Structure 1
């Protein structure tokens, strides 16, 4: 019918009708809630492979209808011609091509619909690099390098997405094999331990197994592994002058810099699929800027990531014999102060979790006021530290799936057949 959400700190009640437009299953039912499952649903808008006409065209008509509605047409000459044009195109190529305006609209709205993103107040401010003319891995690398340079902007980070050719028959996919454009290698040591980033151990072995010479350090920027038109992937080294990095120091603990920690400034997600009117863009690296907790809480303090809590706590002279001393919690705060202080000192864009969550509450108010709603995944929006002293903790949220969207996709090495 028409669902309300309340913020238990301010008592603001919001009334959602936008959820009436959602198409895909969430995974939940009236009897089971899947709100904490990472991939709860496999409901897709299109079938396994190259769809027939009655499969692709309805999705296309829906997107075109929606875009022309967005600009106060619908039924206009251009809209009706566009339907004819997409119709003939599917008839003659089993697919269709988005106009440049449609492509920008869909990317921005995929971000606007990303239930899990705390950063969406910026959604309409997004630079879109059309890369659909690309044909080879070298061209992909040229496009990605230009993306990184524009997005980094000497530290004043700018949001951007680069969109490579859409999927055609499933055998000609463009893929960035890296999960992010810039990540650190991880190495499996002989004494069982792990050097660098443990999350990236498998991808690092693929790179080494592809001819990459590992420097074998704690912060080795990985090479790019780029696949164009279903061909075997190719390795490229991002020119280091394009990889902005921030050494981590602490504003009171002088010894903190001696931990030898750094991180990169540009988070650039390169393994997701962008879905627009039944078209699948399997390579659409997008970047924005970090929330400090991403680095200082998850990257640094997860147990299967860098796991630096004991080292920081030891240097802090903390009681580490029992959990009740909250030594982990004390170190966790100091690490996150350091990450923030370091980025702001080098004038690299970063947002703390207090300001970011406040902005999202304000984004929520705007979206209900003009759009009748805002899909939001509480499990992902609430920051991984100090949850209840941020406003989103006390905010009820409705989660639902709107298109266009960003979707997960399989890692290509589970699917690729080499040649």
Structure 2
């Protein structure tokens, strides 16, 4: 049936028909909603219908459904799965599928950009050195001297599960984290464990507060290998405040390129377990989560110190004051260094415009409210007031298990 979503601020009512096309589960039932669970719970016979559905929507997207080219592709794909237990996507299908996995990512507020995506085909890669070369070209292309460009690099698909290509880093660029003897943590505490895998594999840690981690790349199921991204390819921004001149003395920096490297791209039943993709940051990703999560850099006390705020009672909102100033600094710093960044007001507004577009031309837009609403100032952004329907469309980005939990050395 048709379903209606309403924006309680504007009273706009959009009508969703696109959800009728889903078949993957969401995790919910009629009796329990799992909307805030972060991760709720092939063969030749599983593969062809998935392939058929994907080929069908591709040829339907270029408005040649049931065409001769369409019909031959179906048989081409049928014979190929038959004789080989898998198949290979055409270039056009690879690009279509990657853009549409982004389009369908319900947790991404940046999707108004979905059709501007540079797709790098790396399916001829065979070694970790080749992966490193492909990844360096990606980073260079996407960074573009601060004029960031969305990109994805796609390595060979899964075959038997024993020859997987994996980027073991969860993101291409991250800072190391170190367990200090006295119990505290230097660097990024989220990466203490991965840093120790790199140390244990031979990485010489500078043991600073913002050490860019090496790449750890696994090709064709082999043991992973370490590589250092050339530093001139790693663009970084010293964080300073437009009014508080003491802010630069905090010694804070961050990298310009957000690039998720641990997800699985599924297209037509094929699984690409190494598909690093990147865009540009929304300021709150750095200013709220990375810097102010209690389990991340956790800088709120320090900033509130220099601001000389009353920190004895929570109801002074000293944390909320320091939070806003930290996020002002991040936006100001990136903009002053001409590095692409978007504030959560502009991003959410664009996302509302995007939803409007997708409802008109596509009949819906899957969206996960829990993730779309920014982690600060929620209700002064328009998405807070926007009812959203969440559902799973394919091609898609999915989570997969960490490689250090399954790999036999």
Shared fold, TM over 0.5: yes
Residue 54 of structure 1 and its aligned partner are, at CA, apart by: 1.4
Cα deviations across residues 288-338 of structure 1 (Å, max 9, x unaligned)? 000000000000000000000000000110101110110000000000000
Cα deviations across residues 370-398 of structure 1 (Å, max 9, x unaligned)? 00000000000000000000000000000
SS of corresponding position for 2:139: helix
Q: State the TM-score, normalized to the length of structure 2.
A: 1.00
Cα deviations across residues 231-252 of structure 1 (Å, max 9, x unaligned)? 0000000000000000000000
Cα deviations across residues 134-160 of structure 1 (Å, max 9, x unaligned)? 000000000000000000000000000
Cα deviations across residues 179-237 of structure 1 (Å, max 9, x unaligned)? 10000000000111000000000000000000000000100000000000000000000
Aligned 1:7-406 pairs, distance under 5 A:
7-41=7-41, 51-406=42-397
Q: Distance in 2 between matches of 1:260 and 1:120?
A: 33
Q: Distance in 1 between matches of 2:319 and 2:162?
A: 48
Residue 174 of structure 1 and its aligned partner are, at CA, apart by: 0.3
Q: Distance in 1 between matches of 2:283 and 2:65?
A: 43
Residue 93 of structure 1 and its aligned partner are, at CA, apart by: 1.2
SS of corresponding position for 1:96: coil
Residue 133 of structure 1 and its aligned partner are, at CA, apart by: 0.3
Cα deviations across residues 13-68 of structure 1 (Å, max 9, x unaligned)? 00000000011110111111000000123xxxxxxxxx332111111011001101
Residue 171 of structure 1 and its aligned partner are, at CA, apart by: 0.4
Residue 92 of structure 1 and its aligned partner are, at CA, apart by: 1.4
SS of corresponding position for 2:331: helix
Cα deviations across residues 165-185 of structure 1 (Å, max 9, x unaligned)? 000000000000001000000
Q: Distance in 2 between matches of 1:29 and 1:413?
A: 33
SS of corresponding position for 1:108: helix
Q: State the TM-score, normalized to the length of structure 1.
A: 0.97
RMSD (Å) for aligned C-alpha atoms: 0.5
Residue 88 of structure 1 and its aligned partner are, at CA, apart by: 1.2
The alignment covers a number of residue pairs equal to 409
Q: Distance in 2 between matches of 1:72 and 1:260?
A: 55
Q: Distance in 1 between matches of 2:186 and 2:79?
A: 55
Cα deviations across residues 255-302 of structure 1 (Å, max 9, x unaligned)? 000000000000000000000010000000000000000000000000
SS of corresponding position for 2:246: helix
Q: Distance in 1 between matches of 2:181 and 2:341?
A: 37
Q: Distance in 1 between matches of 2:348 and 2:316?
A: 28
Q: Distance in 1 between matches of 2:358 and 2:199?
A: 46
SS of corresponding position for 1:254: coil
Q: Distance in 2 between matches of 1:128 and 1:185?
A: 29
With 2-11 and 87-96 compared, the bigger mean Cα shift is at: 87-96
With 80-89 and 218-227 compared, the bigger mean Cα shift is at: 80-89
Tell me which residue corresponds to 2:3. Answer: 3
Q: Distance in 2 between matches of 1:375 and 1:246?
A: 34
With 378-387 and 64-73 compared, the bigger mean Cα shift is at: 64-73
Residue 87 of structure 1 and its aligned partner are, at CA, apart by: 1.0
Q: Distance in 1 between matches of 2:340 and 2:266?
A: 29
- The runs of 5 or more residues in structure 1 that have no matched partner are 42-50
Tell me which residue corresponds to 1:44. Answer: none
Residue 74 of structure 1 and its aligned partner are, at CA, apart by: 1.7
Q: Distance in 2 between matches of 1:58 and 1:288?
A: 32
- The runs of 5 or more residues in structure 2 that have no matched partner are none
SS of corresponding position for 1:154: helix
Residue 73 of structure 1 and its aligned partner are, at CA, apart by: 1.0
With 231-240 and 69-78 compared, the bigger mean Cα shift is at: 69-78
Q: Distance in 2 between matches of 1:11 and 1:134?
A: 51
Q: Distance in 1 between matches of 2:279 and 2:211?
A: 22
